Amino acid sequence: SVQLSRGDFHSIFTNKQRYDNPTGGVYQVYNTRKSNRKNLIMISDGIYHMKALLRNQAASKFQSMELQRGDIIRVIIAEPAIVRERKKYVLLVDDFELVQSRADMVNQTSTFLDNYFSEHPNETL
């Protein structure tokens, strides 16, 4: 249907050029939660899923678009974060655009990014 940025979450946290400008990726919403906890979502690059915290315009758009699992987005403004004392990975997303609503799930059984880096402690930035 639409092509996701396969494996890009791995790139963001292993390549410093990508870490420093983690934008333009096309990802699929993997899960959402039913007050600021609403803005934490799960996204999928087709291979990995990871947590994303929507802020600012992205949090506004989450409300105005009724963003849900299956939606495909393109991240426009973002920065990575690693909570190193909990080994948690997050993409802080300040703006995105909607690519396709309610697309068929690309990979229903992806690898949680944080689990992959728990087994790859030397590759992670």
């Binding site: 939660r33 039913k34 600021n36 906890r37 934490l40 947590k51 915290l53 802020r55 920065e79 974060a81 909570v83 909990r86 948690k88 997050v90 802080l92």
Partner: peptide, 15 residues
């Protein structure tokens, strides 16, 4: 939709 990621929200969010 629970409290397991309160860490992410507390530490992050603010830039």
């Amino acid at each position: 939709s629970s409290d397991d990621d309160d860490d992410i929200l507390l530490e992050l969010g603010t830039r």
